[PDB]
Design a protein around this ligand. Structure first.
Ligand SMILES: CCCCCCCCCCCCO[C@@H]1O[C@H](CO)[C@@H](O[C@H]2O[C@H](CO)[C@@H](O)[C@H](O)[C@H]2O)[C@H](O)[C@H]1O
Ligand SMILES: CCCCCCCCCCCCO[C@@H]1O[C@H](CO)[C@@H](O[C@H]2O[C@H](CO)[C@@H](O)[C@H](O)[C@H]2O)[C@H](O)[C@H]1O
Ligand SMILES: CCCCCCCCCCCCO[C@@H]1O[C@H](CO)[C@@H](O[C@H]2O[C@H](CO)[C@@H](O)[C@H](O)[C@H]2O)[C@H](O)[C@H]1O
Ligand SMILES: CCCCCCCCCCCC
Ligand SMILES: CCCCCCCCCCCC
Ligand SMILES: CCCCCCCCCC
Ligand SMILES: CCCCCC
Ligand SMILES: CCCCCC
Lengths: 169, 240, 49
Protein backbone atom coordinates (compact mmCIF):
# COMPACT_ATOMS: atom_id res chain seq x y z
CA UNK A 1 0.00 0.00 0.00
CA UNK A 2 2.52 2.63 1.31
CA UNK A 3 5.55 1.72 -0.94
CA UNK A 4 3.72 2.44 -4.29
CA UNK A 5 0.10 3.38 -5.27
CA UNK A 6 -1.66 5.05 -8.28
CA UNK A 7 0.67 5.65 -11.32
CA UNK A 8 -2.43 5.99 -13.62
CA UNK A 9 -2.14 9.61 -14.95
CA UNK A 10 1.56 8.99 -15.95
CA UNK A 11 1.04 5.96 -18.31
CA UNK A 12 -2.25 7.29 -19.89
CA UNK A 13 -0.57 10.74 -20.48
CA UNK A 14 2.22 8.94 -22.48
CA UNK A 15 -0.52 6.81 -24.20
CA UNK A 16 -2.36 10.10 -25.13
CA UNK A 17 0.94 11.65 -26.45
CA UNK A 18 2.00 8.49 -28.45
CA UNK A 19 -1.56 8.08 -29.96
CA UNK A 20 -1.30 11.78 -31.13
CA UNK A 21 2.24 11.18 -32.60
CA UNK A 22 1.08 7.92 -34.37
CA UNK A 23 -1.98 9.81 -35.82
CA UNK A 24 0.32 12.76 -36.85
CA UNK A 25 2.55 10.27 -38.81
CA UNK A 26 -0.60 8.60 -40.37
CA UNK A 27 -2.13 11.95 -41.60
CA UNK A 28 1.23 13.82 -42.08
CA UNK A 29 -0.35 16.67 -39.99
CA UNK A 30 0.08 18.09 -36.41
CA UNK A 31 -3.62 19.29 -36.40
CA UNK A 32 -5.75 16.48 -38.04
CA UNK A 33 -5.03 13.99 -35.16
CA UNK A 34 -7.23 16.18 -32.82
CA UNK A 35 -10.32 15.42 -35.05
CA UNK A 36 -9.89 11.69 -34.03
CA UNK A 37 -8.69 12.18 -30.37
CA UNK A 38 -11.84 14.30 -29.52
CA UNK A 39 -14.04 11.08 -29.76
CA UNK A 40 -12.53 9.57 -26.51
CA UNK A 41 -15.22 11.16 -24.23
CA UNK A 42 -18.17 9.99 -26.48
CA UNK A 43 -17.55 6.33 -25.39
CA UNK A 44 -16.51 7.19 -21.76
CA UNK A 45 -19.85 8.99 -20.90
CA UNK A 46 -21.89 5.87 -21.92
CA UNK A 47 -19.62 3.47 -19.93
CA UNK A 48 -19.81 5.76 -16.81
CA UNK A 49 -23.65 6.08 -17.17
CA UNK A 50 -24.03 2.24 -17.58
CA UNK A 51 -21.74 1.48 -14.54
CA UNK A 52 -23.36 4.31 -12.44
CA UNK A 53 -27.01 3.21 -13.15
CA UNK A 54 -26.17 -0.51 -12.41
CA UNK A 55 -24.29 0.42 -9.16
CA UNK A 56 -20.93 -0.97 -10.48
CA UNK A 57 -17.46 0.55 -9.67
CA UNK A 58 -14.47 1.95 -11.69
CA UNK A 59 -12.50 -1.38 -11.55
CA UNK A 60 -10.05 -3.37 -13.81
CA UNK A 61 -12.94 -4.82 -15.94
CA UNK A 62 -14.47 -1.29 -16.44
CA UNK A 63 -11.01 0.20 -17.38
CA UNK A 64 -9.99 -2.52 -19.96
CA UNK A 65 -13.60 -2.48 -21.34
CA UNK A 66 -13.32 1.36 -21.69
CA UNK A 67 -9.91 1.16 -23.55
CA UNK A 68 -11.59 -1.38 -25.96
CA UNK A 69 -14.57 1.05 -26.49
CA UNK A 70 -12.11 4.00 -27.09
CA UNK A 71 -10.16 1.72 -29.54
CA UNK A 72 -13.18 1.03 -31.85
CA UNK A 73 -14.58 4.64 -31.59
CA UNK A 74 -11.10 6.10 -32.46
CA UNK A 75 -10.69 3.47 -35.27
CA UNK A 76 -14.16 4.52 -36.67
CA UNK A 77 -13.06 8.22 -36.49
CA UNK A 78 -9.66 7.39 -38.17
CA UNK A 79 -11.38 5.73 -41.22
CA UNK A 80 -13.96 8.64 -41.46
CA UNK A 81 -11.12 11.27 -41.36
CA UNK A 82 -8.94 9.10 -43.73
CA UNK A 83 -11.76 8.74 -46.37
CA UNK A 84 -12.52 12.54 -46.18
CA UNK A 85 -8.80 13.58 -46.51
CA UNK A 86 -8.41 11.05 -49.43
CA UNK A 87 -11.39 12.65 -51.35
CA UNK A 88 -9.88 16.16 -50.70
CA UNK A 89 -6.28 15.11 -51.68
CA UNK A 90 -6.90 12.65 -54.60
CA UNK A 91 -10.44 13.39 -55.99
CA UNK A 92 -9.94 17.12 -55.10
CA UNK A 93 -13.39 17.51 -53.40
CA UNK A 94 -14.44 20.34 -51.00
CA UNK A 95 -14.24 20.02 -47.16
CA UNK A 96 -18.06 19.63 -46.64
CA UNK A 97 -18.78 17.41 -49.73
CA UNK A 98 -15.83 15.03 -48.89
CA UNK A 99 -16.81 14.85 -45.14
CA UNK A 100 -20.45 14.00 -46.17
CA UNK A 101 -19.16 11.34 -48.68
CA UNK A 102 -16.85 9.90 -45.92
CA UNK A 103 -19.60 9.47 -43.21
CA UNK A 104 -22.07 8.20 -45.94
CA UNK A 105 -19.54 5.45 -46.97
CA UNK A 106 -18.47 4.64 -43.32
CA UNK A 107 -22.04 4.41 -41.80
CA UNK A 108 -22.81 0.73 -42.75
CA UNK A 109 -19.46 -0.75 -41.49
CA UNK A 110 -19.60 1.33 -38.20
CA UNK A 111 -23.18 0.09 -37.38
CA UNK A 112 -22.32 -3.49 -38.60
CA UNK A 113 -19.46 -3.62 -35.98
CA UNK A 114 -21.35 -1.70 -33.20
CA UNK A 115 -24.47 -3.99 -33.33
CA UNK A 116 -22.33 -7.20 -33.63
CA UNK A 117 -20.18 -6.34 -30.51
CA UNK A 118 -23.01 -4.70 -28.39
CA UNK A 119 -25.18 -7.85 -28.99
CA UNK A 120 -22.04 -10.07 -28.55
CA UNK A 121 -21.50 -8.75 -24.94
CA UNK A 122 -25.27 -9.24 -24.12
CA UNK A 123 -24.61 -12.70 -22.53
CA UNK A 124 -22.10 -10.97 -20.11
CA UNK A 125 -24.55 -8.11 -19.13
CA UNK A 126 -27.43 -10.60 -18.32
CA UNK A 127 -24.93 -13.32 -17.12
CA UNK A 128 -25.74 -15.24 -13.88
CA UNK A 129 -23.91 -18.24 -12.30
CA UNK A 130 -20.13 -18.72 -11.71
CA UNK A 131 -18.03 -15.56 -12.43
CA UNK A 132 -21.09 -13.37 -13.33
CA UNK A 133 -19.62 -10.55 -11.12
CA UNK A 134 -16.70 -10.22 -13.62
CA UNK A 135 -18.95 -10.86 -16.71
CA UNK A 136 -21.54 -8.22 -15.54
CA UNK A 137 -18.65 -5.72 -14.85
CA UNK A 138 -17.06 -6.24 -18.36
CA UNK A 139 -20.28 -6.27 -20.49
CA UNK A 140 -22.06 -3.35 -18.68
CA UNK A 141 -19.23 -0.77 -19.27
CA UNK A 142 -18.69 -1.96 -22.91
CA UNK A 143 -22.44 -2.06 -23.92
CA UNK A 144 -22.97 1.41 -22.31
CA UNK A 145 -19.79 2.84 -23.92
CA UNK A 146 -20.40 1.29 -27.41
CA UNK A 147 -24.00 2.72 -27.83
CA UNK A 148 -23.00 6.37 -26.97
CA UNK A 149 -19.71 6.00 -28.98
CA UNK A 150 -21.76 4.66 -31.99
CA UNK A 151 -24.67 7.23 -31.98
CA UNK A 152 -22.57 10.34 -30.98
CA UNK A 153 -19.40 9.67 -33.13
CA UNK A 154 -21.39 9.43 -36.46
CA UNK A 155 -22.66 13.06 -35.80
CA UNK A 156 -19.56 14.49 -33.94
CA UNK A 157 -16.55 13.08 -35.96
CA UNK A 158 -17.74 15.00 -39.10
CA UNK A 159 -17.98 18.18 -36.88
CA UNK A 160 -14.47 17.53 -35.34
CA UNK A 161 -12.77 17.10 -38.79
CA UNK A 162 -14.58 20.12 -40.40
CA UNK A 163 -13.94 22.40 -37.32
CA UNK A 164 -10.26 21.25 -36.86
CA UNK A 165 -9.50 21.51 -40.66
CA UNK A 166 -10.88 25.14 -40.60
CA UNK A 167 -8.96 26.42 -37.46
CA UNK A 168 -5.65 25.14 -39.04
CA UNK A 169 -6.00 26.58 -42.63
CA UNK B 1 -15.67 -22.38 -19.12
CA UNK B 2 -18.52 -19.77 -18.72
CA UNK B 3 -16.28 -17.16 -20.54
CA UNK B 4 -15.42 -19.80 -23.26
CA UNK B 5 -19.25 -20.25 -23.69
CA UNK B 6 -19.78 -16.43 -24.13
CA UNK B 7 -17.00 -16.42 -26.83
CA UNK B 8 -18.99 -19.10 -28.80
CA UNK B 9 -22.29 -17.18 -28.11
CA UNK B 10 -20.63 -13.85 -29.21
CA UNK B 11 -19.36 -15.46 -32.52
CA UNK B 12 -22.94 -16.83 -33.18
CA UNK B 13 -24.46 -13.33 -32.48
CA UNK B 14 -21.73 -11.77 -34.76
CA UNK B 15 -22.80 -14.29 -37.52
CA UNK B 16 -26.52 -13.24 -37.21
CA UNK B 17 -25.79 -9.42 -37.32
CA UNK B 18 -23.48 -10.12 -40.36
CA UNK B 19 -26.29 -12.14 -42.12
CA UNK B 20 -28.66 -9.12 -41.56
CA UNK B 21 -26.32 -6.83 -43.64
CA UNK B 22 -24.53 -9.23 -46.10
CA UNK B 23 -27.77 -11.31 -46.61
CA UNK B 24 -25.93 -14.37 -48.12
CA UNK B 25 -24.45 -17.38 -46.19
CA UNK B 26 -20.95 -17.50 -47.87
CA UNK B 27 -20.31 -13.71 -47.37
CA UNK B 28 -21.44 -14.00 -43.67
CA UNK B 29 -18.74 -16.71 -43.00
CA UNK B 30 -15.80 -14.36 -44.01
CA UNK B 31 -15.98 -12.22 -40.79
CA UNK B 32 -17.21 -15.31 -38.78
CA UNK B 33 -14.09 -17.38 -39.84
CA UNK B 34 -11.61 -14.46 -39.23
CA UNK B 35 -12.49 -14.16 -35.45
CA UNK B 36 -11.79 -17.78 -34.26
CA UNK B 37 -8.65 -17.96 -36.57
CA UNK B 38 -7.17 -14.83 -34.80
CA UNK B 39 -8.43 -15.84 -31.27
CA UNK B 40 -6.96 -19.42 -31.61
CA UNK B 41 -3.76 -17.75 -32.99
CA UNK B 42 -3.69 -15.45 -29.88
CA UNK B 43 -3.59 -18.58 -27.57
CA UNK B 44 -0.40 -19.72 -29.45
CA UNK B 45 1.19 -16.22 -28.86
CA UNK B 46 0.30 -16.41 -25.09
CA UNK B 47 1.98 -19.91 -25.08
CA UNK B 48 5.16 -18.46 -26.75
CA UNK B 49 5.33 -15.63 -24.10
CA UNK B 50 4.73 -17.96 -21.08
CA UNK B 51 1.24 -16.50 -20.27
CA UNK B 52 -1.63 -18.74 -18.94
CA UNK B 53 -5.37 -19.18 -19.79
CA UNK B 54 -6.92 -17.05 -16.95
CA UNK B 55 -10.02 -14.84 -16.25
CA UNK B 56 -8.15 -11.70 -17.54
CA UNK B 57 -6.58 -13.32 -20.69
CA UNK B 58 -10.01 -14.99 -21.42
CA UNK B 59 -11.85 -11.59 -21.07
CA UNK B 60 -9.04 -10.19 -23.30
CA UNK B 61 -10.30 -12.65 -26.00
CA UNK B 62 -13.97 -11.51 -25.48
CA UNK B 63 -13.08 -7.74 -25.71
CA UNK B 64 -10.74 -8.52 -28.69
CA UNK B 65 -13.72 -9.90 -30.78
CA UNK B 66 -14.91 -6.25 -31.29
CA UNK B 67 -11.50 -5.26 -32.80
CA UNK B 68 -11.27 -8.56 -34.84
CA UNK B 69 -14.76 -8.39 -36.54
CA UNK B 70 -14.14 -4.64 -37.32
CA UNK B 71 -10.86 -5.53 -39.20
CA UNK B 72 -12.82 -8.27 -41.12
CA UNK B 73 -16.01 -6.10 -41.60
CA UNK B 74 -13.93 -3.04 -42.81
CA UNK B 75 -12.33 -5.34 -45.50
CA UNK B 76 -15.56 -7.28 -46.47
CA UNK B 77 -17.94 -4.21 -46.45
CA UNK B 78 -15.49 -2.03 -48.52
CA UNK B 79 -15.31 -4.79 -51.26
CA UNK B 80 -19.19 -4.92 -51.28
CA UNK B 81 -19.29 -1.05 -51.55
CA UNK B 82 -16.72 -1.05 -54.47
CA UNK B 83 -18.66 -3.92 -56.22
CA UNK B 84 -21.93 -1.89 -55.77
CA UNK B 85 -20.49 1.54 -56.90
CA UNK B 86 -18.58 0.26 -60.03
CA UNK B 87 -19.83 -3.33 -60.76
CA UNK B 88 -16.34 -4.98 -60.62
CA UNK B 89 -16.21 -8.80 -60.08
CA UNK B 90 -15.30 -10.00 -56.52
CA UNK B 91 -11.60 -10.66 -57.46
CA UNK B 92 -11.08 -7.15 -59.05
CA UNK B 93 -13.07 -5.22 -56.34
CA UNK B 94 -11.03 -7.12 -53.64
CA UNK B 95 -7.62 -6.14 -55.22
CA UNK B 96 -8.93 -2.51 -55.50
CA UNK B 97 -10.48 -2.42 -51.95
CA UNK B 98 -7.29 -3.88 -50.29
CA UNK B 99 -5.18 -1.28 -52.23
CA UNK B 100 -6.98 1.69 -50.51
CA UNK B 101 -7.41 0.38 -46.85
CA UNK B 102 -4.51 -2.17 -46.28
CA UNK B 103 -2.23 0.81 -45.38
CA UNK B 104 -4.75 2.21 -42.81
CA UNK B 105 -5.35 -1.28 -41.21
CA UNK B 106 -1.55 -1.60 -40.43
CA UNK B 107 -1.43 2.10 -39.32
CA UNK B 108 -4.55 1.77 -37.05
CA UNK B 109 -3.06 -1.33 -35.26
CA UNK B 110 0.07 0.78 -34.34
CA UNK B 111 -2.20 3.68 -33.11
CA UNK B 112 -4.35 1.16 -31.10
CA UNK B 113 -1.19 -0.62 -29.71
CA UNK B 114 -0.26 2.82 -28.17
CA UNK B 115 -3.63 2.58 -26.23
CA UNK B 116 -3.15 -0.99 -24.77
CA UNK B 117 0.72 -1.33 -24.48
CA UNK B 118 1.17 1.46 -21.84
CA UNK B 119 -0.89 -0.40 -19.11
CA UNK B 120 1.55 -3.39 -19.50
CA UNK B 121 4.06 -1.06 -17.64
CA UNK B 122 1.99 -0.86 -14.37
CA UNK B 123 4.25 -1.94 -11.44
CA UNK B 124 3.98 -4.53 -8.61
CA UNK B 125 0.70 -6.41 -7.78
CA UNK B 126 -1.64 -4.47 -10.19
CA UNK B 127 1.03 -4.68 -12.98
CA UNK B 128 0.61 -8.42 -13.85
CA UNK B 129 -3.26 -8.07 -13.91
CA UNK B 130 -3.24 -5.24 -16.57
CA UNK B 131 -0.32 -6.94 -18.47
CA UNK B 132 -2.59 -10.03 -19.12
CA UNK B 133 -5.06 -7.77 -21.08
CA UNK B 134 -2.37 -5.64 -22.88
CA UNK B 135 -0.45 -8.61 -24.44
CA UNK B 136 -3.66 -10.66 -25.19
CA UNK B 137 -5.42 -7.68 -26.94
CA UNK B 138 -2.23 -6.35 -28.73
CA UNK B 139 -1.30 -9.93 -29.92
CA UNK B 140 -4.91 -10.41 -31.25
CA UNK B 141 -4.79 -7.00 -33.10
CA UNK B 142 -1.38 -7.93 -34.69
CA UNK B 143 -2.75 -11.35 -35.90
CA UNK B 144 -6.06 -9.60 -36.95
CA UNK B 145 -4.15 -7.27 -39.39
CA UNK B 146 -2.06 -10.27 -40.68
CA UNK B 147 -5.36 -12.28 -41.12
CA UNK B 148 -6.94 -9.17 -42.80
CA UNK B 149 -4.00 -9.14 -45.35
CA UNK B 150 -3.87 -12.97 -46.09
CA UNK B 151 -7.18 -14.89 -45.50
CA UNK B 152 -9.94 -12.17 -45.52
CA UNK B 153 -8.87 -10.92 -49.03
CA UNK B 154 -8.58 -14.55 -50.37
CA UNK B 155 -12.09 -15.39 -48.98
CA UNK B 156 -13.54 -12.06 -50.37
CA UNK B 157 -12.19 -12.95 -53.89
CA UNK B 158 -13.59 -16.56 -53.82
CA UNK B 159 -16.73 -16.55 -51.53
CA UNK B 160 -18.36 -13.08 -52.20
CA UNK B 161 -21.24 -13.07 -54.80
CA UNK B 162 -20.89 -10.63 -57.77
CA UNK B 163 -22.93 -7.38 -57.16
CA UNK B 164 -24.15 -5.34 -60.22
CA UNK B 165 -23.48 -1.53 -60.38
CA UNK B 166 -26.11 0.47 -58.37
CA UNK B 167 -27.62 -2.69 -56.71
CA UNK B 168 -28.05 -2.08 -52.91
CA UNK B 169 -30.44 -5.10 -52.57
CA UNK B 170 -33.54 -2.79 -52.76
CA UNK B 171 -34.97 -5.14 -55.49
CA UNK B 172 -35.00 -8.15 -53.05
CA UNK B 173 -38.47 -9.39 -51.87
CA UNK B 174 -39.08 -10.37 -48.19
CA UNK B 175 -37.41 -8.96 -45.00
CA UNK B 176 -34.06 -8.15 -46.78
CA UNK B 177 -36.04 -6.24 -49.49
CA UNK B 178 -37.65 -3.97 -46.82
CA UNK B 179 -34.45 -3.69 -44.64
CA UNK B 180 -32.26 -2.71 -47.68
CA UNK B 181 -34.81 0.06 -48.64
CA UNK B 182 -35.07 1.14 -44.92
CA UNK B 183 -31.22 1.44 -44.57
CA UNK B 184 -30.79 3.25 -47.98
CA UNK B 185 -33.46 5.83 -46.86
CA UNK B 186 -31.92 5.97 -43.31
CA UNK B 187 -28.47 6.69 -44.93
CA UNK B 188 -30.04 9.71 -46.81
CA UNK B 189 -31.77 10.90 -43.55
CA UNK B 190 -28.31 10.59 -41.83
CA UNK B 191 -26.27 12.59 -44.46
CA UNK B 192 -29.11 15.23 -44.67
CA UNK B 193 -28.91 15.46 -40.80
CA UNK B 194 -25.03 15.74 -40.78
CA UNK B 195 -25.22 18.26 -43.71
CA UNK B 196 -27.45 20.42 -41.44
CA UNK B 197 -25.17 19.89 -38.35
CA UNK B 198 -22.10 21.12 -40.36
CA UNK B 199 -23.93 24.49 -41.01
CA UNK B 200 -24.57 24.97 -37.21
CA UNK B 201 -21.20 23.57 -35.88
CA UNK B 202 -20.82 26.04 -32.93
CA UNK B 203 -23.92 24.69 -31.05
CA UNK B 204 -22.32 21.14 -31.15
CA UNK B 205 -18.89 22.36 -29.85
CA UNK B 206 -20.83 23.76 -26.79
CA UNK B 207 -22.93 20.50 -26.61
CA UNK B 208 -19.59 18.53 -26.73
CA UNK B 209 -18.20 20.55 -23.73
CA UNK B 210 -21.46 19.55 -21.86
CA UNK B 211 -20.73 15.80 -22.64
CA UNK B 212 -17.06 16.29 -21.45
CA UNK B 213 -18.14 18.06 -18.16
CA UNK B 214 -20.93 15.41 -17.78
CA UNK B 215 -18.17 12.74 -18.16
CA UNK B 216 -15.82 14.50 -15.63
CA UNK B 217 -18.65 14.71 -12.97
CA UNK B 218 -19.62 10.98 -13.41
CA UNK B 219 -15.89 9.88 -13.24
CA UNK B 220 -15.23 11.43 -9.74
CA UNK B 221 -18.74 10.40 -8.43
CA UNK B 222 -18.29 6.69 -9.49
CA UNK B 223 -16.59 4.72 -6.64
CA UNK B 224 -13.31 2.97 -7.75
CA UNK B 225 -12.52 -0.70 -6.78
CA UNK B 226 -10.01 -3.32 -8.18
CA UNK B 227 -11.44 -6.88 -8.77
CA UNK B 228 -15.03 -7.84 -7.72
CA UNK B 229 -15.66 -10.40 -4.90
CA UNK B 230 -16.94 -13.55 -6.74
CA UNK B 231 -19.27 -16.20 -5.20
CA UNK B 232 -16.93 -19.27 -5.51
CA UNK B 233 -19.47 -21.79 -4.04
CA UNK B 234 -17.37 -22.02 -0.79
CA UNK B 235 -16.61 -19.92 2.36
CA UNK B 236 -15.26 -20.41 5.95
CA UNK B 237 -16.49 -19.61 9.53
CA UNK B 238 -13.94 -18.79 12.33
CA UNK B 239 -14.72 -19.84 15.98
CA UNK B 240 -12.40 -17.93 18.42
CA UNK C 1 13.08 5.17 -47.34
CA UNK C 2 15.02 8.50 -47.55
CA UNK C 3 12.76 9.72 -50.46
CA UNK C 4 9.68 8.58 -48.39
CA UNK C 5 10.59 10.72 -45.28
CA UNK C 6 11.84 13.71 -47.42
CA UNK C 7 8.11 14.16 -48.42
CA UNK C 8 6.93 13.11 -44.87
CA UNK C 9 9.00 15.19 -42.36
CA UNK C 10 6.24 14.89 -39.62
CA UNK C 11 6.42 11.01 -39.78
CA UNK C 12 10.26 11.46 -39.59
CA UNK C 13 9.85 13.65 -36.41
CA UNK C 14 7.22 11.22 -34.89
CA UNK C 15 9.69 8.23 -35.14
CA UNK C 16 12.47 10.41 -33.55
CA UNK C 17 10.16 11.78 -30.74
CA UNK C 18 8.82 8.25 -29.81
CA UNK C 19 12.50 7.00 -29.57
CA UNK C 20 13.43 10.01 -27.31
CA UNK C 21 10.26 9.25 -25.22
CA UNK C 22 11.19 5.54 -24.63
CA UNK C 23 14.73 6.77 -23.70
CA UNK C 24 13.52 9.58 -21.37
CA UNK C 25 11.22 7.08 -19.54
CA UNK C 26 14.00 4.38 -19.49
CA UNK C 27 16.56 6.73 -17.75
CA UNK C 28 14.14 7.19 -14.75
CA UNK C 29 14.04 3.38 -14.02
CA UNK C 30 17.67 2.38 -15.02
CA UNK C 31 19.88 1.23 -12.09
CA UNK C 32 23.11 3.26 -11.36
CA UNK C 33 26.52 1.71 -10.40
CA UNK C 34 30.31 2.14 -11.05
CA UNK C 35 30.36 -1.26 -12.91
CA UNK C 36 27.85 -3.98 -13.83
CA UNK C 37 28.44 -7.54 -12.45
CA UNK C 38 32.11 -7.85 -13.66
CA UNK C 39 33.20 -10.08 -10.68
CA UNK C 40 32.93 -13.89 -11.07
CA UNK C 41 30.84 -15.30 -8.16
CA UNK C 42 32.37 -17.03 -5.05
CA UNK C 43 30.96 -19.47 -2.40
CA UNK C 44 32.76 -19.74 1.03
CA UNK C 45 32.46 -22.81 3.37
CA UNK C 46 33.20 -21.75 7.03
CA UNK C 47 33.86 -24.41 9.76
CA UNK C 48 35.21 -24.26 13.39
CA UNK C 49 37.14 -26.97 15.38
C1 LIG D 1 -13.41 -20.50 -31.15
C2 LIG D 1 -12.60 -19.54 -30.31
C3 LIG D 1 -11.79 -20.27 -29.25
C4 LIG D 1 -12.55 -20.43 -27.94
C5 LIG D 1 -11.61 -20.53 -26.75
C6 LIG D 1 -10.85 -21.86 -26.74
C7 LIG D 1 -11.23 -22.73 -25.55
C8 LIG D 1 -10.48 -22.34 -24.29
C9 LIG D 1 -10.60 -23.43 -23.24
C10 LIG D 1 -9.93 -23.02 -21.94
C11 LIG D 1 -9.85 -24.16 -20.93
C12 LIG D 1 -9.10 -25.35 -21.52
O1 LIG D 1 -8.53 -26.17 -20.49
C13 LIG D 1 -7.92 -27.33 -21.05
O2 LIG D 1 -8.92 -28.21 -21.56
C14 LIG D 1 -8.37 -29.31 -22.28
C15 LIG D 1 -9.52 -30.10 -22.91
O3 LIG D 1 -10.34 -29.24 -23.70
C16 LIG D 1 -7.53 -30.17 -21.34
O4 LIG D 1 -6.85 -31.18 -22.09
C17 LIG D 1 -7.43 -32.48 -21.95
O5 LIG D 1 -7.22 -33.26 -23.13
C18 LIG D 1 -8.02 -34.44 -23.18
C19 LIG D 1 -9.31 -34.13 -23.92
O6 LIG D 1 -10.20 -35.25 -23.88
C20 LIG D 1 -8.29 -35.02 -21.78
O7 LIG D 1 -8.44 -36.44 -21.88
C21 LIG D 1 -7.18 -34.70 -20.78
O8 LIG D 1 -7.61 -35.08 -19.47
C22 LIG D 1 -6.80 -33.22 -20.77
O9 LIG D 1 -5.37 -33.09 -20.82
C23 LIG D 1 -6.49 -29.33 -20.59
O10 LIG D 1 -5.90 -30.12 -19.55
C24 LIG D 1 -7.11 -28.08 -19.99
O11 LIG D 1 -6.09 -27.22 -19.47
C1 LIG E 1 10.33 2.77 -31.13
C2 LIG E 1 10.02 2.59 -32.60
C3 LIG E 1 9.86 3.94 -33.29
C4 LIG E 1 8.92 3.85 -34.49
C5 LIG E 1 7.51 4.31 -34.13
C6 LIG E 1 6.61 4.36 -35.36
C7 LIG E 1 5.17 4.66 -34.98
C8 LIG E 1 4.41 5.42 -36.07
C9 LIG E 1 3.36 4.56 -36.76
C10 LIG E 1 2.28 5.43 -37.38
C11 LIG E 1 1.42 4.66 -38.39
C12 LIG E 1 1.55 5.26 -39.78
O1 LIG E 1 0.80 4.47 -40.71
C13 LIG E 1 1.18 4.70 -42.07
O2 LIG E 1 0.85 6.04 -42.46
C14 LIG E 1 1.30 6.36 -43.77
C15 LIG E 1 1.02 7.83 -44.05
O3 LIG E 1 1.97 8.34 -45.00
C16 LIG E 1 0.61 5.46 -44.80
O4 LIG E 1 1.19 5.70 -46.08
C17 LIG E 1 0.25 5.91 -47.14
O5 LIG E 1 -0.28 7.24 -47.01
C18 LIG E 1 -0.61 7.94 -48.21
C19 LIG E 1 -1.80 7.28 -48.91
O6 LIG E 1 -2.72 8.28 -49.38
C20 LIG E 1 0.60 8.09 -49.13
O7 LIG E 1 1.24 9.35 -48.88
C21 LIG E 1 1.63 6.97 -48.95
O8 LIG E 1 2.30 6.73 -50.19
C22 LIG E 1 0.97 5.69 -48.47
O9 LIG E 1 1.96 4.66 -48.33
C23 LIG E 1 0.76 3.99 -44.45
O10 LIG E 1 -0.12 3.21 -45.27
C24 LIG E 1 0.44 3.72 -42.98
O11 LIG E 1 0.82 2.38 -42.64
C1 LIG F 1 -26.49 15.96 -24.43
C2 LIG F 1 -25.91 15.38 -25.70
C3 LIG F 1 -26.98 15.21 -26.78
C4 LIG F 1 -26.40 14.49 -27.99
C5 LIG F 1 -27.09 14.91 -29.29
C6 LIG F 1 -26.24 14.48 -30.49
C7 LIG F 1 -26.90 14.80 -31.82
C8 LIG F 1 -28.28 14.15 -31.96
C9 LIG F 1 -28.54 13.61 -33.36
C10 LIG F 1 -28.45 14.69 -34.44
C11 LIG F 1 -29.80 15.37 -34.66
C12 LIG F 1 -29.63 16.84 -35.02
O1 LIG F 1 -30.61 17.19 -35.99
C13 LIG F 1 -30.12 18.05 -37.02
O2 LIG F 1 -29.82 19.33 -36.46
C14 LIG F 1 -29.39 20.30 -37.41
C15 LIG F 1 -28.96 21.57 -36.68
O3 LIG F 1 -29.85 21.86 -35.60
C16 LIG F 1 -30.53 20.55 -38.40
O4 LIG F 1 -30.17 21.56 -39.36
C17 LIG F 1 -31.25 22.41 -39.76
O5 LIG F 1 -31.20 23.65 -39.04
C18 LIG F 1 -30.05 24.47 -39.29
C19 LIG F 1 -30.13 25.75 -38.46
O6 LIG F 1 -31.38 25.83 -37.75
C20 LIG F 1 -29.93 24.78 -40.78
O7 LIG F 1 -28.71 25.49 -41.04
C21 LIG F 1 -29.96 23.51 -41.61
O8 LIG F 1 -29.98 23.83 -43.00
C22 LIG F 1 -31.18 22.67 -41.26
O9 LIG F 1 -31.14 21.42 -41.97
C23 LIG F 1 -30.86 19.24 -39.12
O10 LIG F 1 -31.96 19.41 -40.02
C24 LIG F 1 -31.20 18.16 -38.10
O11 LIG F 1 -31.34 16.90 -38.76
C1 LIG G 1 4.26 -5.85 -26.70
C2 LIG G 1 4.65 -4.97 -25.53
C3 LIG G 1 5.58 -5.70 -24.57
C4 LIG G 1 5.38 -5.21 -23.13
C5 LIG G 1 6.61 -5.48 -22.27
C6 LIG G 1 6.25 -5.79 -20.82
C7 LIG G 1 7.13 -5.01 -19.85
C8 LIG G 1 6.94 -5.52 -18.42
C9 LIG G 1 7.95 -4.89 -17.46
C10 LIG G 1 7.29 -3.96 -16.44
C11 LIG G 1 8.09 -3.92 -15.14
C12 LIG G 1 7.75 -5.08 -14.23
C1 LIG H 1 9.31 3.07 -50.62
C2 LIG H 1 8.51 2.94 -49.34
C3 LIG H 1 9.43 2.86 -48.13
C4 LIG H 1 8.67 3.05 -46.83
C5 LIG H 1 9.63 2.99 -45.65
C6 LIG H 1 8.91 3.04 -44.30
C7 LIG H 1 9.62 2.18 -43.25
C8 LIG H 1 9.62 2.84 -41.88
C9 LIG H 1 10.32 1.95 -40.86
C10 LIG H 1 10.69 2.72 -39.60
C11 LIG H 1 11.51 1.84 -38.66
C12 LIG H 1 11.93 2.60 -37.41
C1 LIG I 1 5.51 17.00 -29.26
C2 LIG I 1 4.76 17.46 -30.49
C3 LIG I 1 5.39 18.65 -31.17
C4 LIG I 1 4.46 19.42 -32.08
C5 LIG I 1 5.16 20.21 -33.16
C6 LIG I 1 4.50 21.54 -33.50
C7 LIG I 1 4.41 21.83 -34.98
C8 LIG I 1 4.49 23.30 -35.34
C9 LIG I 1 4.71 23.55 -36.81
C10 LIG I 1 4.43 24.98 -37.24
C1 LIG J 1 -5.93 3.20 -10.65
C2 LIG J 1 -6.40 4.64 -10.52
C3 LIG J 1 -7.79 4.88 -11.04
C4 LIG J 1 -8.00 4.47 -12.48
C5 LIG J 1 -8.88 5.40 -13.27
C6 LIG J 1 -9.14 4.94 -14.69
C1 LIG K 1 -22.46 -25.10 -19.07
C2 LIG K 1 -22.05 -25.28 -20.51
C3 LIG K 1 -20.73 -25.99 -20.69
C4 LIG K 1 -19.51 -25.15 -20.40
C5 LIG K 1 -18.29 -25.55 -21.20
C6 LIG K 1 -18.20 -24.88 -22.55
Amino acid sequence: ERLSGNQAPSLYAISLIVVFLCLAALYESWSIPFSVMLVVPLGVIGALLAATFRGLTNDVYFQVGLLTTIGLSAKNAILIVEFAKDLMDKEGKGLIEATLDAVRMRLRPILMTSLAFILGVMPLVISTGAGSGAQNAVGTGVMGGMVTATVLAIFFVPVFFVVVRRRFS
Amino acid sequence: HEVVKTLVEAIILVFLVMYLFLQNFRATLIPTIAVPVVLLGTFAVLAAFGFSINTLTMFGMVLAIGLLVDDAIVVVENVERVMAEEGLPPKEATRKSMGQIQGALVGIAMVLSAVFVPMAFFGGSTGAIYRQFSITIVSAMALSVLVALILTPALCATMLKPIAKGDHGEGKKGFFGWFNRMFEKSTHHYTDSVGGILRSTGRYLVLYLIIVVGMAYLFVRLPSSFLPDEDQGVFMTMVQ
Amino acid sequence: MPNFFIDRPIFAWVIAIIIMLAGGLAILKLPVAQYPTIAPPAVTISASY
